[PDB]
Design a protein around this ligand. Sequence first.
Ligand SMILES: COc1nccnc1CC(C)C
Ligand SMILES: [Cl-]
Length: 157
Amino acid sequence: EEASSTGRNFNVEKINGEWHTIILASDKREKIEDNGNFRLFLEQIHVLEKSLVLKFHTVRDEECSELSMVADKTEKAGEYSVTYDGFNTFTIPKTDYDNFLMAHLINEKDGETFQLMGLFGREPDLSSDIKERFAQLCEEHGILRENIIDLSNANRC
Ligand SMILES: COc1nccnc1CC(C)C
Ligand SMILES: [Cl-]
């Protein structure tokens, strides 16, 4: 079964646990390139009553830096907000809970904005078919494939 965080049948408890960043995509590519602040490697999602605790790490000169963020539910069901390199809101347009999770995030900083999309997997990689479904979701948001970066061979410290 699959669901969207904005959907009626969404079960947030089921996204709790281990996750890995498989692919990141953005209409401002610099944000996810080397040293971009959004080149984030997810490790875990802890589901709480009204928030999600996100554990990530970034990498600089082959050195891993841990970071934790708390995302709070907003007034729209399935949407969360979090302060990080600006103000962010995000939703999960599609997840099957057991294998993949696709997220769409809007960042706003210094009066600007950009879209960030992410494909996260329970294991350190996902099938080529799920990677293709993710490229199609990115296309529905106006994000070109050339702005989609597979990080499955760069997600372990
Ligand atoms: C694009 O998705 C994201 N990107 C950066 C930070 N958080 C998210 C939300 C996910 C982890 C649910
Ligand atoms: Cl489509």
